[PDB]
A paper describes a structure:
As anticipated, the ɸEL subunits displayed the typical three-domain architecture of chaperonins, composed of an equatorial domain (residues 2–130 and 425–552), an intermediate domain (residues 131–188 and 388–424), and an apical domain (residues 189–387). The domain structures of ɸEL differ from those of GroEL by numerous insertions and deletions, which alter the putative substrate-binding cleft and the contacts at the ring-ring interface. Our functional data rather suggests that the chaperone mechanism of ɸEL is encapsulation independent, and represents an evolutionary precursor of the more complex encapsulation mechanisms used by the group I and II chaperonins.
In contrast to crystal form I, the subunits in crystal form II exhibited considerable conformational differences (r.m.s.d. range 0.60–4.43 Å), and two new states could be assigned (conformations II and III). Subunits with conformation II (chains B, D, F) alternate with subunits in conformation III (chains A, C, E) around the ring, with the remaining chain G having conformation I. Superposition of the subunits in conformations II and III showed that the apical domain can pivot by ~22° around the joint with the intermediate domain (as determined with the program DynDom). In chains A, C and E (conformation III) the apical domain is re-oriented, allowing residues 290–294 to contact the tip of the intermediate domain of the adjacent subunit (chains B, D and F; conformation II). This re-orientation of the apical domains of chains A, C and E also results in the αK-αL helical hairpin to point outwards into the solvent. The apical-intermediate domain intra-ring contact also requires a 19–21° outward rotation of the intermediate domains in chains B, D and F. The orientation of the intermediate domain correlated with the identity of the bound nucleotide: The subunits with outward-oriented intermediate domain (chains B, D and F) contained weak nucleotide density, consistent with partial occupancy by ADP. The nucleotide electron density for the subunits with inward-oriented intermediate domain (chains A, C, E and G) was consistent with nucleoside triphosphate, modelled as ATP and Mg2+.
Residue numbers in the entry:
A (entry chain A): 2 to 551
B (entry chain B), C (entry chain G): 2 to 289, 295 to 551
Amino acid sequence: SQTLLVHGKDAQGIIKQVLSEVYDAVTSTMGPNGQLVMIKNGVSTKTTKDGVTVARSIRFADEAHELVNRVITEPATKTDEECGDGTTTTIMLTHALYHLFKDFPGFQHHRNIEDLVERVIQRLESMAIRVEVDDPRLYQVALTSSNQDEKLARLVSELYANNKGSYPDIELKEGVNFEDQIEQTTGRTIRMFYANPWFAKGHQGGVTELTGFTAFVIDRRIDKEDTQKLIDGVNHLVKTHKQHLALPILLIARSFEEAANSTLMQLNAAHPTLVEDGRPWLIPLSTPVGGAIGTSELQDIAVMLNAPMLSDVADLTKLDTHSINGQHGQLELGGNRSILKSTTPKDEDRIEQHARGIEELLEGFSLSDKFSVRARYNERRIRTLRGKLITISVGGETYSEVKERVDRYEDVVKAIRSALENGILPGGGVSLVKAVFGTIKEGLEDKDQSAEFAKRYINSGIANELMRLSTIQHKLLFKDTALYKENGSFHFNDDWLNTPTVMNLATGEIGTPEGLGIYDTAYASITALKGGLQTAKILATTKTLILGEK
Amino acid sequence: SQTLLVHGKDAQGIIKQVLSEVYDAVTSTMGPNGQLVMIKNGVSTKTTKDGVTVARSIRFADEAHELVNRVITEPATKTDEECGDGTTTTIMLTHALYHLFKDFPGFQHHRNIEDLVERVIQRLESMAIRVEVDDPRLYQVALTSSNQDEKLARLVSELYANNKGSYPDIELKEGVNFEDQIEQTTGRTIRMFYANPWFAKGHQGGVTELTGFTAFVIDRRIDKEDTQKLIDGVNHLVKTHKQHLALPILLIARSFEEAANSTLMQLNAAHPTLVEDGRPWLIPLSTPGTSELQDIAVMLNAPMLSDVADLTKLDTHSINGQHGQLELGGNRSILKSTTPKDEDRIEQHARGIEELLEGFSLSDKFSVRARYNERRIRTLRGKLITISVGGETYSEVKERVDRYEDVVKAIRSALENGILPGGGVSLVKAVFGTIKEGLEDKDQSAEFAKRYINSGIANELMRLSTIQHKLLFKDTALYKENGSFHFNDDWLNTPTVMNLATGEIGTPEGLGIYDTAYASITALKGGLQTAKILATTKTLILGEK
Amino acid sequence: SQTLLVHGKDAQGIIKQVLSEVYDAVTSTMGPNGQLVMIKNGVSTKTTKDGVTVARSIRFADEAHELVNRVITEPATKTDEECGDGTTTTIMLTHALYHLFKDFPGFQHHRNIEDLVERVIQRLESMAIRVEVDDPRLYQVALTSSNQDEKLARLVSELYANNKGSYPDIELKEGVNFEDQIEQTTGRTIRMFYANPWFAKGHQGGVTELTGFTAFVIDRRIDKEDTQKLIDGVNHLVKTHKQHLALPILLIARSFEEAANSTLMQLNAAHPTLVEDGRPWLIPLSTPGTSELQDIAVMLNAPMLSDVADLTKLDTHSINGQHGQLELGGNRSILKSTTPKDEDRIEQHARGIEELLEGFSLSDKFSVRARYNERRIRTLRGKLITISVGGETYSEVKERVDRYEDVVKAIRSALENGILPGGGVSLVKAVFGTIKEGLEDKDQSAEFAKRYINSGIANELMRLSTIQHKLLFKDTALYKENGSFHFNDDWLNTPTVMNLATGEIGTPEGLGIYDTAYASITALKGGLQTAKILATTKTLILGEK
Ligand SMILES: Nc1ncnc2c1ncn2[C@@H]1O[C@H](COP(=O)(O)OP(=O)(O)OP(=O)(O)O)[C@@H](O)[C@H]1O
Ligand SMILES: Nc1ncnc2c1ncn2[C@@H]1O[C@H](COP(=O)(O)OP(=O)(O)OP(=O)(O)O)[C@@H](O)[C@H]1O
Ligand SMILES: Nc1ncnc2c1ncn2[C@@H]1O[C@H](COP(=O)(O)OP(=O)(O)O)[C@@H](O)[C@H]1O
Ligand SMILES: [K+]
Ligand SMILES: [K+]
Ligand SMILES: [Mg+2]
Ligand SMILES: [Mg+2]
């Protein structure tokens, strides 16, 4: 509050400082030989090595400093919410790339640094190694992500490897015993969830369990312009077609804005005769689809529940026993996601038939398009359709040791899911070195464009400096070890590039990441570089801080 | 609070400081190097490049400093509320002109600087290109504002060019398909809305749709002093003249205070025989400039009434109930079905407004008077369009929706506010021209030289117009060759800028870089006023009472 | 709040400081010649020698310091909640091992120090001496843990030795007389209690005493979703199978929510013919690890049932009503009369649990898994005893109650887990042994020397085990004046300590100085973990979000 507008040297100075402090703090936790961080919270101390936990909990006293800290940390926090891993690497690159931008100021270099790094990202995306559940490397991924758990990696790799032909959705509950206990189910993690907490059991976003329903899938996003179409629709079914109707009526759609949610709350109050044990007879259910990819996923939700597909909300009126079909199965609605369990063999014929239709669409398209987003999304549909819900109940000697073991399970599930989903890359901070050193040699060697490539990147000094960045992770991991010469030097020659040598920080043996089984998820380490670049550019190109509150 | 009256050197010192800090902050958000600003708000950080956002959110700790900051920033904030764009330019000039006033002190120079800049403003107003929808430059504007979208610019420029004779109001919805889909209507976004949520369908501010009505436009603001005139009025129509009357009865007015709204709720309860499906047969409708109601009157065939008591003395001559189609709303009402009988009455009324603008000065053509009258025309002759944007994902759609909305805003304000060549050029041409005109006119060249040229003002004012062009294209290849000293005659004839998106050099006309005239003119108008103020303040009072 | 992120040298500096201050404070209280600590609390002063009390009550003013203090002390506090003793030793090792980690930095040494100490832990677990109640050493343990109470050790050692064939559960009440008074029972403190006060005698949570019943153990937690399954279940037994049924019907389960409790109140009102002296014929009983219900099932001849709906499908085969004697209670239920027919079923079940532990790893013998299973055994076989401690005053009684409870905890864990020779010796033997084993085994001696001996670790780890023996017997006749004490082979074979009570020198085995193994092992286990943490922390965060 002494000064509320920082500009120029002063502002960048703060950014450089905050970035250095956050970098030093978070990167100290890297690998299994990561050092620890003690964190206050009222009257307790959390000791931890988890980058996402350290990053999220760092705080600065000065408003100006925290202002910047929020920009550095929120992108790290955004990685684990989506990718499930790789915040530390993001911050490390955010730092390293920031200094790269500053070392080559002037906003022609910036255009070039963006272009060069963007090409390095493509070379990672190509390097990505895709794998099947049978593959032995999934263990090695799980092992790396479980902080070297010889026990768990085996279990979860088996679960995936044993169900070859179906991709297991996994849940986690805090168990009771010292030993774990597994429960394999026919359930499906469906992507629908409550529009408003009021529609649940107890009217506060609880987990409503049902043994019968009548769903209807709408496509449109719903807002104040749909409130009348709902009133006409709902009362047309509850008046005319109440005979053949099992409650509740599920209205599954793209989005339910608050103007329409409050309309359907009063439509529930309109017919109090149909309320059983508090359960509202009508529930709006939203999905994070959107776009054309978004239409197909609702079609899956429609097929699983026997509900018809409807383009408009006004189509609710013109319906008949032909188009209305109320199921007597079993469904568990939830705020995060809904889950189906009881599926009559009558239904599973409809589902497997629908899944074959999707499989046939992929059988008749190009090999290049087989690795597209189109194909990958369609396989994401199949595995929703034919998914084997598993519930593991984790256990242990205490309460806290159980809840921590639950977290370590969830880390591994996230890792393995995204491994087969997205790809795996060789670890030990190597893939980035290969990706950069490669991207340089490709443009430097291509005679066609070598002319200008040299002018932009090599001759300017950028290319050289960008090679030195990829070394950072490999240095942070394996400085202060036998793999490095005492003075700190480590040569990244052609011989290294062909067979890159890392050290397993668990055992102590030296070897290749492929040989030693050290692997990273590709979506993490790619998103790390993508996000690192964006948020580095921001920091590097900010010249004004405003702490004015008004 | 240590001292509550600053006078003289001390006061100007504060002003110069605050102005410099605000100038440096806001002008840094212009260009290819154009820098960002990180802004606090409780427990969040807004990163932004938007001048109006930066200006509005700048704060100073010292009372004395913020006192001045309020004067510098409020005129920037006032530009985007009216013009829609151009705050950064206003502040830039406010700064540059302030120093001009201070470099030539003594209040004969000030009279001359005002006079000279006022003449430069006239030379801009003349330079203004009023662009019609047919014009090919609207594409080029849309193209620039769409980040070089070869596809969209075409579509939206066509939409505007294809409806020659009506100005399309455009809405945007997040669609479902990979492809976009357009829905054209003959509708008009009318400025009337519910006085009370009770009068809507379902009695809670919903969207009541109608296929017939009988409107009546009153002028007065309505409160507790009008409750009796309404009771006399409403029952006089519903009793005497019910035969020739389609429900509902719309009572459009300036303002309906809650004392009168509760009276009309009971007047609806008075005649329950006229209630169809819950729809109340009487709706009060308010509007946020007395002739905008005259437009609302003409669109719906309702008569204009000065007093509420005039409701009684009416006849079939003055009562006319429409059987069209109307969608009432809490934000705004929308008309759709318009019989060709009506659209003759509307187009005739629009011509009457157009004729009023044909017989008045060029300086007044950029007034609020003229601009408001054109706002009326486009309400009268408007066509509602709903585009549903689509794409392969969710985020790519919602981002494409934003890129559409940027283009609509640009094209609307382009034809609305008139177009000038961009790249900080038009000001250079306008100043360098104004000098050469007075310097070359032998009649008045005598005194013109004494006032402006010989004093040193003219020279220094040319140097100011260069500011924007410098701030944009310093640190680029366009200033690598010659440098700063090259605004020669050859430049003036074919002014050379750089498209900061692509990287190519060329004319603003060639490269499609254009500014709205009302923005860049208002910038200079406001910049001068608020520069004069700052330059001629010698006392700060932080006495709060 | 001056700074909210400490990193590197600064952070470790704080840790080293806080650890030293806590070490000096707590280790000063060691043994019976332990020095004292005066502790504030509002308007009082607790003088004490109790490590757990000192550790728990230490406070630091600086947030940064207490942040670390919480990490050092919570593991000490966690030992006495589980083990019943040995916090001081934990902290002492936490300190000593921390400095070991720091003396050999680089995280290959750390891997080796962990591996070496982990092997020393195994050598303790093997050294553990297991004891039966008849054994004379239980006295010697009790004597050590009772601060040399010649009177008490005898009593409690007799109580355990006299009930050879049953493990006495012991309670403590603040008595009235100068003399103590013992009350032996055959009973079993069972973990079941009333779900609702209404089901007791007098319908207000009283102590209902019975001489016959028919129990049924359900597993599920019960709520509004089980009310129908109960109505079907209860009436199926009371109608079909009433002949072979002694009232009341006990429904033992995990949890009874209020929705189900009110259902069973009306089911009691349904059959008023079965009400004897107010006693409701049906009582729901809750418990705060699914096999603890299996114990409750086996003690009362009731069957185990997974679902509430399983109540219907039952027969004389599965229904067995006892005619023993049971005292229900709001805190806990108590069994007394057990026909020798039953105690055959119970002892057989207890052997089944004992057999499960007999084929368990030695490391897992000190787990929570094993310790919980022994908690089951002692519920099953035990003879509840209530001692009422007495004395000359109030405070001398309540303090004598605490000294009893210390001894009970010690003796229980002694026979439960094992005993080790005291005087800070067993650790010296365990380390010096572990070295000589690996150093002497030709097979692995090659690499063993490279890792531990040649690096310097092994040497330094031998010097740590000496710490406790030094802290106890420095400043005594057993140590040479200058402070030197030689731990040669001759010492290792017959280790020489001093009884700090009497003053005589001799072996721990000879002088009767013994430690509980689970304490001194858990001390080293926890000491290593929390030393590693402290040694490998480089960042303190005092940020509140
Ligand atoms: N046993 C190992 N030997 C060598 N390198 C390893 C080993 N295990 C993991 N790594 C490497 O360490 C890095 C992983 O860092 P770390 O797990 O500390 O943070 P992160 O995975 O980036 O994100 P988070 O901190 O959220 O886990 C990767 O480069 C990985 O290849
Ligand atoms: N008469 C004695 N002579 C010599 N050493 C003894 C005697 N009695 C106890 N000790 C020793 O003192 C140590 C016990 O320390 P102390 O009881 O002060 O703390 P602790 O057992 O670690 O935990 P707590 O402080 O909670 O009791 C053991 O090494 C034990 O052998
Ligand atoms: N591609 C371009 N090349 C050259 N000049 C541009 C380009 N795009 C925008 N400009 C000019 O730079 C100015 C920057 O706008 P902005 O910083 O938002 O100022 P304001 O907030 O005052 O409108 C615009 O008013 C426009 O005249
Ligand atoms: K980590
Ligand atoms: K003690
Ligand atoms: Mg990792
Ligand atoms: Mg002790």
